[PDB]
């Protein structure tokens, strides 16, 4: 599964916290990318691994 | 020939719908709309850049 | 002969019911329901994979 | 006892925080594993051990 979400409110949550973030909001949903190539994601100065 | 090309298949769903008991597990995000009739239209993904 | 197969036993309840002075020791869980009138009906189990 | 839970929300909050997850919610409950084997629970990228 690739990195997907529903709205950008969960993408900007996932970049802030990557351990305590929500995978499922009220109707909104976000899927963490699990893959062999662990892609490094930058969004401004927030960065996850 | 040691620089080979692996080809993974990535999939992600769009426009899904949660069950009617709708929960949340991030107490930080708050949308300014109704939570009960909330469902996504799209899916935000990330590029290679 | 040494590579033996120990087999344990696992057990879990399905669809229990808390007593009527209900409570919660959490913060970031909000369920769109009347909290004093909810009980489980299914149990979620994590697989081997 | 295995990792039973009366909702998806308790699973997805037990994956997030570990020392401060909710054992007993309003009407739902989760059950920590005290099994002799110890499995890592690869959920997205949020493991627990």
From Swiss-Prot, chains B, C:
S-S bridge residues: none
Annotated compartments: Virion; Host nucleus
Recorded superkingdom: Viruses
Residues in coiled coil: none
Described purpose of this protein according to its UniProt entry: Self-assembles to form an icosahedral capsid with a T=16 symmetry, about 200 nm in diameter, and consisting of 150 hexons and 12 pentons (total of 162 capsomers). Hexons form the edges and faces of the capsid and are each composed of six MCP molecules. In contrast, one penton is found at each of the 12 vertices. Eleven of the pentons are MCP pentamers, while the last vertex is occupied by the portal complex.
Family: Belongs to the herpesviridae major capsid protein family.
Subunit structure: Homomultimer. Makes the hexons and eleven out of twelve pentons. Interacts with triplex proteins 1/TRX1 and 2/TRX2; adjacent capsomers are linked together in groups of three by triplexes, heterotrimeric complexes composed of one molecule of TRX1 and two molecules of TRX2. Interacts with scaffold protein; this interaction allows efficient MCP transport to the host nucleus. Interacts with capsid vertex component 2/CVC2. Interacts with the small capsomere-interacting protein/SCP.
Protein known as: Major capsid protein
Organism of origin: Epstein-Barr virus (strain B95-8) (HHV-4)
Upper taxonomic lineage: Viruses, Duplodnaviria, Heunggongvirae, Peploviricota, Herviviricetes
Complete-protein stretch covered: 396 to 444 of 1381
């Amino acid at each position: 599964p690739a990195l997907s979400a529903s709205s950008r409110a969960l993408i900007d949550e996932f970049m802030s916290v990557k351990q305590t973030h929500a995978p499922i909001h009220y109707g909104h949903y976000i899927i963490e990318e699990v893959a062999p190539v662990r892609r490094i994601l930058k969004f401004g100065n927030k960065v996850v691994f | 020939p040691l620089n080979r090309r692996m080809q993974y298949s990535y999939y992600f769903p769009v426009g899904l719908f949660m069950p009617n008991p709708k929960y949340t597990t991030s107490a930080a995000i708050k949308m300014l709309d109704n939570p009960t009739q909330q469902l996504p239209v799209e899916a935000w993904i990330v590029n290679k850049n």
